[PDB]
Amino acid sequence: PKLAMSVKDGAVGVAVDAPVTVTAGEGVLGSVTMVNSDGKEIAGEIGPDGVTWTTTEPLGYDKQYTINADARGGGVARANATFRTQSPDNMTMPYVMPGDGEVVGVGQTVAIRFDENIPNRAAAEKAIKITTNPPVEGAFYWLNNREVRWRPESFWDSGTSVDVKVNTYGVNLGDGVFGQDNVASHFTIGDAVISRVDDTNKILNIERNGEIIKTMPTSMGKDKAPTNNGTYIIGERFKDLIMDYRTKVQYATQMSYSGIYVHAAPWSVGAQGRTNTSHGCLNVSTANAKWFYENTKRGDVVIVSNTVGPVLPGTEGLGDWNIPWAQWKAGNAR
Template identity: 50%
Template sequence: MRHGGLRAGRVAVVLGVVALSAAFTAGVSGCSSGNPPVRRAVAAGSGLAMLRPTVTASVRDGQTEVSPAQPVTVSVAGGAVRRVTLLNPENAVVPGAVSPDGASWHSTERLGYRRTYRLRVEAVGLAGVSDSVMTFRTVAPGNVTKPYPVPLDGELVGIGQPVVVQFDENIADRWAAQNAVTVATDPPVPGAFYWVSNRELHWRPEKYWAPGTKVRVDVAAYGKHLGAGVFGQDDAHVAFAVGDPVIYTADDATKQVTVTRNGQVIRTMPTSMGKSSTPTPNGIYLVGNRVDRMVMDSSTYGVPVHSAAGYRVNVDYATQLSYNGIYMHSAPWSLWAQGSQNTSHGCLNLSPSNAEWVVHSAKRGDIVVVRNTQGPVLDGADGLGDWNMPWAQWKAGNAGPAPAPAPGPAPIQAAGTR
């Protein structure tokens, strides 16, 4: 994987201090009734020396392992920011902004990984100008991982669709990853996180979504240490909406799949499900990916293709129902059994026309209920079986013990007067 690194540059931030300078002039060069001003020597360490501005920065000179996700901040006590210049290794200026009161500055562009920066701060006060210079280096990750939110941005989903964040590396610090994810809903809906694998995090409410709910997901992973030397490669943001409630009910007692929308039956389809040696699990499934054609290969779940139970076939109009290989799909070879007998390896066989209708009509996150089979219940951590896990267990989560709060870095003071 490529490592993150960002170019920084544009303009330095300069704060005019005309009013402040005028105040200083009035304070140190006042006159009395036409008499010449009285000049007094000021000894080092006297009260005037104590009036020099003090600069506090979020980084210190020589510091390493600085997070590139956090803005560099500067504050001034006893004065105001005159000029701040933050340079990257190419001597380009990292942009920043001064606060309205002139007492602080912060960078406005994120930094890059494994890069050295030079920070110079000039502050003006009653006793002159403080000029501070420091150099620091950002963290060098051992590896980086990119977050991929599901659903896609702008997608209309079914009432069962969880928020999903997939990573392309294993996540050792699950709490750090969870804390990087923010879920906002309209109207507000409480929910909870659960990890279905070392690379996939889900968030769902206690009950199915209400149609019309809008959801926004922000993953602020960049610069975050996610454990074992792995850092977030980038941030990610998606927004999606919940559509009409559509429920597919596959009943092994009737060998039929009944489809309802808003509680009204809109289609009934004969099916052939898993035979007695490979029964289809009961429970609540979610519609996942839909494809017009795919290759189904038994070796992907441990059964050699050339064994008695093995297969490798092209399948049309396949709708994913689980991560462990269960699909609704076109099966013209089992038309004779659909509606009367189970013959599959666990999938829901449909006629070509019915399978095509499902692929082109179903939404990601639509509910599929399988009942009355000889199989167990689909695992709640399958990846598309979220609703089979009791809410109390889901809400408790599985990120491990909550970490103790880490103390923030102590501010570093750097002051000098010229």
């Protein structure tokens, strides 16, 4: 009568992503019980041919378990193991942008922001199944020790499904940092809205699926405080906003982490379409701001051309698209 458990008496670091099993040859399992060191029984169940038992709930970090099994058959047999699971130095809890069931523009990238620095980026990337329909090739670039982005080579085709599954429970992400739980998000890609502006004209030209549907005159950033050139991904928006000068501002659709918004500037209508009078923001009229507030969604693009300012930095960001595919696809795990 032979018993075989998938863990060993006195083992340590048992993984909590995998179940524990107990099997038997030369006969048949009779009873198998597993309990944490506080007594609480852990759930498992014997299979329909009486030869394997598996746990049905998952194990917990920083626990000890005792499993007792016996098998009937030759005849009588017994097994015993007490072990500890992964005993993490630090739990880290990922979050995903965009959120579950959101509809987003063709420049939305898949963020995974951790709340702890991630020593082992490779493990973090391995733990992230992203599933696209229709499928398209993408890759992982990190903007810093806590946030990893994933996008395709070019902008999103409209009506693509994106399923993001971050599965870090039980995954050692380097130097004792393990995932606190799993998280998921499924979202769809909406209409291809892309707004455009050349510092030559200072006219913001909004396309919907390659066809213009609004224009507006903007006053961008002063020579001394210029609006960056390049592709910006839109993010948040606000009906109101204090900006820290300290003053209230309406209908702000955000373009960069660094504080560049399309927003309502009545004080500078005279300048819109003509001369750059702001510290970086796309100044437009209250009526046109409100339109931009109401007609774009997170993930929509804005592109800037011929300002005196630098390129929006790639890792900013919001600046994701500014990085050339070659480099991005290479990633920066090592």
